[PDB]
Structure 1
Amino acid sequence: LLIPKVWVPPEDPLASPSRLAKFLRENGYKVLQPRSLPENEEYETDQILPDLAWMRQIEGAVLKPTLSLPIGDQEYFPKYYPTHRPSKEKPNAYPPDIALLKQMIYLFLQVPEANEGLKDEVTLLTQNIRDKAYGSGTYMGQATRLVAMKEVATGRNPNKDPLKLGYTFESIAQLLDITLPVGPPGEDDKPWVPLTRVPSRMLVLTGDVDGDFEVEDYLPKINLKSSSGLPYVGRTKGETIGEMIAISNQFLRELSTLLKQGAGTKGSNKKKLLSMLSDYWYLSCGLLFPKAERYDKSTWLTKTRNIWSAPSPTHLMISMITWPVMSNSPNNVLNIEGCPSLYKFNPFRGGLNRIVEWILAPEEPKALVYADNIYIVHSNTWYSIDLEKGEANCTRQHMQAAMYYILTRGWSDNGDPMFNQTWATFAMNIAPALVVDSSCLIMNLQIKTYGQGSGNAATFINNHLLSTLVLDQWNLMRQPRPDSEEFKSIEDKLGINFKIERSIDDIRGKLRQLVLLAQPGYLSGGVEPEQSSPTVELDLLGWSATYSKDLGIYVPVLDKERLFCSAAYPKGVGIEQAYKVVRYEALRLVGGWNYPLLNKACKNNAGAARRHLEAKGFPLDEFLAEWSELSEFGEAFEGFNIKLTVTSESLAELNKPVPPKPPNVNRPVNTGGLKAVSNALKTGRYRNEAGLSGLVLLATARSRLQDAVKAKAEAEKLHKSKPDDPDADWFERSETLSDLLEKADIASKVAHSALVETSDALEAV
């Protein structure tokens, strides 16, 4: 067929609890004993959050006059039933862009003579339209995916505790000092508030509502349109802002109280604390949300990606630790010598050109890193590497090391903790157990989660941590070539699975050739293309490279396959026409501009829309005001404040080099790169760059869940012990502190750390 007929998705074989459980059970996938939680009861908002009563008596008061709290007398087992689209019954959910296809075939037929290079565009669009389908897959797909994750975390190459492999909290932190340099929160004459308050206290007021206006919001960024999570299935975070704040407050207040319990009390304080955690088990159970993607039709029943939708309170709590720090750490390879991070990289404004120049540089082997993505240049070959199902490789202690790193580097003033023991206990011994190796909810089944829940506030940091460790092992092996057995052996050493998704030989040569063979187009002569200009499909965070004669630099082009995959299946008065303009112009702007047929087709299809909206008086201009929020590609143009239009001028404006943002860090990163630090740390002799803060957190992690306050004290003492150079040797202060902890008998037993106690409590039935 020239134009494929509508596709009817096969029937979902696991669309019922009985079938799903059977499948999981026969694949050795752990199903937990179900837990129940209190029904939600109505409550006066000003009664629960009296300190925020002011927010409701104003315009833009997201706080409802009442709150639904999980504190009712009767309990219930929660259920989550995701709607999958399209489906055998309603297969018309997300239609292929057949109009675009017809237009392209028409343009090709219009071209006198013939050109196989132009035909390839329709051939590729066609292939995508029949091989793929955009949607949320099926239960069978989510489930099959899950046993794959368990397989990554278990079996072939079982996950490993980095701490039992020779790494230490500080050891991993000095690798991240380079790999993911971080700065303090705020970054102003008037910084950020310390981690010592309950979330509602992050909202401060000045203007008495009678004066004028003045509110200080220190709460993290939150997607109001995303799911609220376990406590409130069927609701958005935006509809549960109050309850999200109230539950976090209550949870943090009880934790504090339980940590300040007096000794010599009727009953064990241990059980009281563990019971409180059990009552909050739902904070460790994410909704198994089916991620809408353009999947392969042949894979509809065997592969659907899942999003571990974290419960609002857990997400808010963890974000109060990570976001303030991370959002102020635009530190990467473009603004810090020796830094392999691509953290807040953007290919536009000269971004891509710098990466290419970094590749061209003769130095090698070298590496770039971004979460679970690793890019290595070795023997003049470019290797795009992916951790295999990254998240499933994560261990509770990996995240613990991540929280340590973030607190010691982001919440510490010259070694001085900027957090109380409540937060230290949460960050080091609660949060890791809540979102890693905890559980999830699908249908009415409470199921195990292997590895970290893809979606928890720290999934990026945790994945970046994992890649960082393989880079460390790579360095210690003298940087073998990625295709070697030596490189692969890193898998067994860290228990982390990975694979090469792409390889490009003679990369410097091919990159230089882009200059020589650039074809005329919007960025080379300022004309409508007739032939696509060559590129190098780096897939650098989704981007390819091509040369611009007009700007004299390399500019980005969206990876060919991704561009045509999106073109084949668009995502979710005359609003329909307005969106088509966004769809078509965005496709061009992001890379379509470099492909003759696609470009002209989107250009024409978009043109018609503008005209139709014109002969309707539609205020298109006011509509596209913040178009970045209406496009699947908007994330790339957010902080650019540009007009949605594709011309040689606009594209030139978009790629015109701009100076890199200044880095924000404490101690100047080892300019010698990761392998300098890798070789150093291997010695076993390194300083405690975390200072007192590091000792406090190490003490908190090695002590009983209940002895957080004492754990800190033993740390403060030990720090004063060596007055001249206390942070001289980490392994020293470590072995010492362990003795002190055991002397005070607050040191947890070998196989029963605070983390394990918490994980068992959350599961306890």
Structure 2
Amino acid sequence: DVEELLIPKVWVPPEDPLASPSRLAKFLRENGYKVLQPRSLPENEEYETDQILPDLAWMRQILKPTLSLPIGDQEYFPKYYPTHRPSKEKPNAYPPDIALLKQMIYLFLQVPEANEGLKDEVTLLTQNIRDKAYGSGTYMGQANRLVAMKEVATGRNPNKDPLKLGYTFESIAQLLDITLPVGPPGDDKPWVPLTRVPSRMLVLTGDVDVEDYLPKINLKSSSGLPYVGRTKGETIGEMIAISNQFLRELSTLLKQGAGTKGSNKKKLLSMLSDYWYLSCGLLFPKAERYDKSTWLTKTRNIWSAPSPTHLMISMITWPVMSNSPNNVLNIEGCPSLYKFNPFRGGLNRIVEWILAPEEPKALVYADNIYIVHSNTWYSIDLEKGEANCTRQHMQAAMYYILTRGWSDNGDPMFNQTWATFAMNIAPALVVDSSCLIMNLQIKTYGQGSGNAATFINNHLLSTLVLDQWNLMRQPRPDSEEFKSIEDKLGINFKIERSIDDIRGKLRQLVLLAQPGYLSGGVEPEQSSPTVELDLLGWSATYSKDLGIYVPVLDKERLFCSAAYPKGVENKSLKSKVGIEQAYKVVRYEALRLVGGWNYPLLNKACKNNAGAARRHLEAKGFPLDEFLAEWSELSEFGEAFEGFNIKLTVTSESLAELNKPVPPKPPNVNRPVNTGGLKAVSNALKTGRYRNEAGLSGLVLLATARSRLQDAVKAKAEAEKLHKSKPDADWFERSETLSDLLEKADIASKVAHSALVETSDALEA
């Protein structure tokens, strides 16, 4: 017979069968995955910081004396060999939480009699320990994942350029007005326009020794090319320097124009080729709880964008986005769940939204669509999302951000250097470009899987699915009619989950709510019922103490986290025996806080384990209070508790305080608030007639996109010749007379050889 143990024997991962460039290259070629002609880049060499950044010399109080820049002669080919953990030879990297499991089993045995509701917790945790494993996966899994990305983009349902499907930059931007309302960059709104290099984004206000405008980047993530094996914090100076140089070289090429008889293309192609590496990401293997059976066939990838490319794109993206908290909870008609938080009465409000008689109705967050239809809740995901994204998808997103975010009442708050970068360079850098895995520079299909960088592109993709959903009279998500939306758009999607009779099930939560922390203020004997909405990973349960619905983390997610904790990740001179225990207090208490409090055995076992570490440290004299000062950064669930300034306690009071309703933040939209909902906008757009609500800046961006790269400064001017003649009254009749004006100056680029394509081909020469 079979063995089956109470505690599974230490798992030994299989040998990675693609641990060689030779082997990997074979696999990619065998699947028709494209391997690029290897590009090389100059060796990094020292240079005085005073010389490269003279304007940032005043860092003489409280920089790094020299900088390492890709300037020295002798080219090298870049190499990225990430470590996979666990592995066959080093298997003990991330052990399952056996101490937790033993404690749960222990407490179950202490219970006088029976109870299978309790035992289900021990079963579920055990099943996770057996089936899954936390780690970096394998090269074989990464490569294998990539072939799936190519299949999404070029196989079953090949990607479609939205502009060749009737959509325009403006009509898309009018849809994003509803599904992603955006304001101006800013409290008080004192922000600078997109007209300067990153160096001058720090201002020496008041002479004789600083206002900070640069987007925030986390100092611990990898720098990327040209600094493999270095972090963003270690390359801050370098990141600015390269961005400066690139943007300065760009503004020269536009200042110089296209020259006589196009004798300046060489200068453009020269530059783009020299900065090829700005379009090459590192295939970082993402660490998560993969299941053992697919350890060799699925490993999620993070496309580590080079820091200059990130900095420049986030200079366009972040000042707008970190200042637009506009969602379903503060704008009527709005389906966006952007910056939604389930605490502070947040979840109750979504549940009340569901209970409302209205249907069909949709909610969006990036690559997530939630739909209630015929009293059924549908949770929908785009297949790989990023993989479906084309360059025109992103340049449409860029058009939207610059139009509604970086424009004062029609007027552009951006120069032509930033306009040309956003419309014609940035999408080519990040979508359908390349990545460096081992020593191999290989193509990426669609956008690379970031998670912050990919938000707006994915949200756009879903917005199109939503528009298309409206156009065919809002069919039931499971129907054939709904499924035909992916054949029409080239975007892959699938129903992740559906709950029949959603309103009845939600209502029943009020009746069947058990005693607990939020109902009677006691330690729960039994789990209180939930509806597993998976609303951004959150479920709904009812609180009798507060009289409202309160969030509990999705049950599978909760027990998936409980089974395999994330690693510490680097521990230098900072203590020794204290840190290991201290992290466990964080681990166990944070588990309770997100939803462990609802699950009697998990709640009690976590409480005991945390209390055990807490008492040990308290007798040892560890500064635990000072440690937990920003526990938010130390926990994998910390994001949801950011700026909340609340202690790790998980009591009746703390849980009630965490959920006590607070009025939603006032919306910040740069234009008069639209409250018509998406359904109406979809029909107004299908007619073909719609107003150019972008203003002048929209005509500037249409000219920049629709003409040649080097003739960008002429493009703005020709669009201003149009703006001075007052018609606006229809976008299409306006858009076509602009295309003629571009043909009158011979600046309009040839079909299939657009400004965006030319820079794509230039990036690998």
Is the contact made by 1:322 and 1:457 (CA closer than 8 Å) also made in structure 2?
no
Give the alignment's TM-score, normalised by structure 2: 0.97
Distance 1:456 1:714, change over 3 A: farther
Partner of 1:193: 192
1:175 is the counterpart of 2:163: no
Runs of 4+ displaced beyond 3 Å: 262-267
Helix, strand or coil: the match of 1:375? Answer: strand
Deviations 1:432-489, CA, capped at 9 Å, x for gaps: 0000000000010000000001127631000000000000000000000000110000
Contact 2:132 2:289 in 1 (8 A): yes
Give a deviation string over 1:77-113, Cα, whole Å, max 9, x none.
Answer: 1000000000001100000000000000000011011
Classify 1:669/1:267 alpha carbon distance in 2 versus 1 (closer, same or farther; 3 Å). Answer: closer
Distance 1:457 1:56, change over 3 A: farther
Distance in 2 between residues matched to 1:190 and 1:671, nearest whole Å: 24
In 2, distance between residues paired with 1:46 and 1:411? 32
For residues 13-46 of structure 1, give each alpha carbon's deviation from its aligned partner in whole angstroms, at most 9, with x where no partner exists: 0001000010000001000000000000100011
SS at match of 2:590: helix
Answer yes or no: is the 8 Å Cα contact 2:183–2:671 preserved in 1: no
Following superposition, the deviation at residue 57 of structure 1 comes to 3.8
Conserved in 2, the CA contact under 8 Å of 1:144 and 1:303?
Answer: yes
Distance in 1, matches of 2:91 and 2:341, equals 37
Question: Hey, what's the Cα distance between the residues in 2 that align with 1:584 and 1:600?
Answer: 10
Cα shift at 1:667: 2.4
- How far apart, CA to CA, are the structure 2 residues paired with 1:611 and 1:657? 34
The residue matched to 1:570 in structure 2 has which SS? coil
Deviations 1:300-326, CA, capped at 9 Å, x for gaps: 000000000000000000000000000
Contact 1:670 1:677 (C-alpha < 8 Å) held by counterparts: no
CA positional deviation for 1:206: 2.8
- Distance 1:11-1:408 versus aligned 2 partners, 3 A rule: same
Secondary structure of 1:147's partner? Answer: helix
Q: Are 2:378 and 2:495, in contact at CA under 8 Å, matched by a contact in 1?
A: yes
Change in 2 beyond 3 A, CA 1:267/1:355: closer
Distance in 2, matches of 1:685 and 1:267, equals 38
3-state SS of paired residue (2:71)? coil
**1:727 shift after superposition:** 1.6
Between the aligned partners of 2:172 and 2:264, the Cα distance in structure 1 is: 33
The offset of 1:671, in angstroms, is 1.5
Deviations, residues 108-141 of structure 1 (Å, cap 9, x unaligned): 0110111000000000000000100000000000
SS in 2 for 1:639: coil
- Equivalents in 2 of 1:132, 1:190: separation in Å? 48
Compared CA separation, residues 424 and 457, structure 1 to 2 (3 A): farther
Contact 1:696–1:715, Cα closer than 8 Å, also in 2: yes
What's the Cα RMSD here? 1.1
- Uncovered stretches (5+) of structure 2, i.e. residues with no partner: 568-576
How big is each residue's C-alpha offset from its partner over 1:611-657, in whole Å with a ceiling of 9 and x where there is no partner? Answer: 00011000111100110000000001012110101011000000000
The one-character-per-residue Cα deviations of 1:391-433 (angstroms, maximum 9, x if unpaired) are: 0000000000000000000000011001110000000000000
SS of the equivalent of 1:167 reads coil
User: 1:506 and 1:264, CA in 2 relative to 1: closer, same or farther beyond 3 A?
Assistant: closer
8 Å contact kept, 1:121–1:598: yes
- Supply the distance in 2 between the matched residues of 1:482 and 1:583 (Cα, whole angstroms): 38
1:476 equivalent among 457, 471, 483: 471
Shift of 1:266: 8.4
Aligned partners of 2:67, 2:684: CA distance in 1, in Å? 54
Deviation string for 1:199-252 (max 9, x for gaps)?
00101113556xxxx810100010110010111000000000000000000000
| Cα separation, partners in 2 of 1:457 and 1:5, compared to 1, 3 Å | closer
How many residues matched?
A: 752
Partner of 2:40: 36
| Residue 155 (structure 1) shift | 1.0
How much does 1:54 deviate? 1.1
By how many angstroms is 1:263 displaced?
A: 5.9
Deviations 1:699-722 (A, max 9, x none): 000000111000101100101112
Deviation of the 1:275 alpha carbon: 1.4
Partners of 2:255 and 2:173 in 1: CA distance: 30
| CA deviation map 1:362-415 (0-9, x unaligned) | 000000000000000000000000000000000000000000000000000011
C-alpha displacement of 1:670: 3.0
Q: Residue 157 of structure 2 contacts residue 486 of structure 2 at CA under 8 Å; is this kept in 1?
A: yes
> For the residues of structure 2 that align with 1:271 and 1:402, how far apart are their CA atoms?
30
1:289–1:632 distance in 2 versus 1, CA, 3 Å: same
Mean alpha-carbon deviation: is it higher for 266-275 or for 126-135? 266-275
Q: Contact 2:303/2:450 (CA < 8 Å) preserved in 1? A: yes
Does the 8 Å CA contact 1:308/1:456 hold for their aligned counterparts?
no
C-alpha offsets along residues 544-582 of structure 1, whole Å, 9 cap, x if unaligned? Answer: 000000000000000000000000001014111111000
State the distance in 1 between where 2:410 and 2:553 align.
44
1:274 Cα deviation from its structure 2 partner: 1.7
Q: Return the offset for 1:260.
A: 0.9
Q: Alpha carbons of 1:727 and 1:307: their partners in 2 closer, same or farther (altered >3 Å)?
A: same
Say whether the 8 Å CA contact 2:140–2:297 is kept in structure 1: yes
Secondary structure at 2:12's aligned position in 1?
A: coil
Q: Secondary structure in 2 aligned to 1:294?
A: strand
Are the counterparts in 2 of residues 178 and 669 from structure 1 also a CA contact under 8 Å? no
- Preserved contact between residue 225 and residue 306 of structure 2 (Cα < 8 Å): yes
Alpha-carbon distance in 2 for matches of 1:611, 1:481:
55
CA contact (8 A) 1:341 1:370 kept: yes
Whole-angstrom distance in 2 between the partners of 1:487 and 1:106: 50
Give the Cα separation in 1 of the matches to 2:324 and 2:649. 31
Maintained 8 Å contact 2:258/2:265: no
Tell me: CA distance 1:475–1:42, structure 2 relative to 1, closer, same or farther (3 Å).
Answer: same
Q: Call closer, same or farther: CA 1:112–1:457 in 2, change over 3 Å.
A: closer
Change (3 A) 1:352 1:627: same
Given that residues 258 and 710 in structure 2 are in contact (C-alpha distance below 8 angstroms), is that contact kept between their aligned partners in structure 1? Answer: no
CA deviation after TM superposition for structure 1 residue 492, in Å: 0.6
**For 2:476 and 2:244, how far apart are their aligned partners in 1?**
51
- 1:615 counterpart SS class: helix
CA contact (8 A) 1:56 1:65 kept: no
Compared CA separation, residues 190 and 547, structure 1 to 2 (3 A): closer
Seen in structure 2, the aligned counterparts of structure 1 residues 409 and 264 have a Cα distance that, compared at 3 Å, is closer
Alpha-carbon separation, structure 1, partners of 2:662 and 2:269:
53
Cα distance in 1 for partners of 2:632, 2:189 equals 31
The CA deviation at 1:669 is 3.7
Larger mean CA deviation between 329-338 and 264-273 belongs to 264-273
Cα distance in 2 between the residues matched to 1:68 and 1:457:
28
Cross-structure match for 2:380: 385
Aligned equivalents of 2:678 and 2:222: distance in 1?
38
SS at match of 1:123: helix
Tell me how far 1:55 sits from its aligned partner.
Answer: 1.8
Q: Does 1:148 align with 2:169?
A: no
Is the alpha carbon distance of 1:613 and 1:263 closer, same or farther for their aligned partners in structure 2, counting shifts above 3 Å?
Answer: closer
* Residues 225 and 264 of structure 1: CA distance in aligned 2, closer, same or farther (over 3 Å): closer
Describe the superposition over 1:146-190 as per-residue Cα deviations: whole angstroms up to 9, x where unpaired. 00000000110000000110000000000000000000001x545
CA distance in 2, matches of 1:181, 1:266: 44
How big is the shift at 1:56? 4.6
Distance of aligned partners of 1:409 and 1:581 in 2 relative to their CA distance in 1, 3 Å threshold: same
Contact 2:257 2:713 in 1 (8 A): no
Q: Retained in 2: the 8 A contact 1:310–1:456?
A: no
1:295 aligns with 2:299: no
Q: Does the CA-based 8 Å contact 1:686-1:730 persist in structure 2? A: yes
- 8 Å CA contact 2:97, 2:564 repeated in 1: yes
Post-superposition shift, 1:763? Answer: 1.3
Compare 135-144 and 267-276 and name the one that shifted more. 267-276
Match of 1:574 among 568, 578, 581: 578
CA–CA separation in structure 1 for the residues paired with 2:242 and 2:595 = 45
Distance in 2 (CA, whole Å) between partners of 1:580 and 1:57 is 39
Give the distance between the partners of 1:331 and 1:468, measured in 2 at CA: 16
CA distance, structure 1, for counterparts of residue 368 and residue 471 of structure 2: 20
Mark the runs of 5 or more structure 1 residues left unpaired by the alignment: none
TM-score, scaled relative to structure 1: 0.97
Distance in 2 between residues matched to 1:264 and 1:546, nearest whole Å: 67
Q: Work out the percentage of aligned pairs sharing the same amino acid.
A: 100
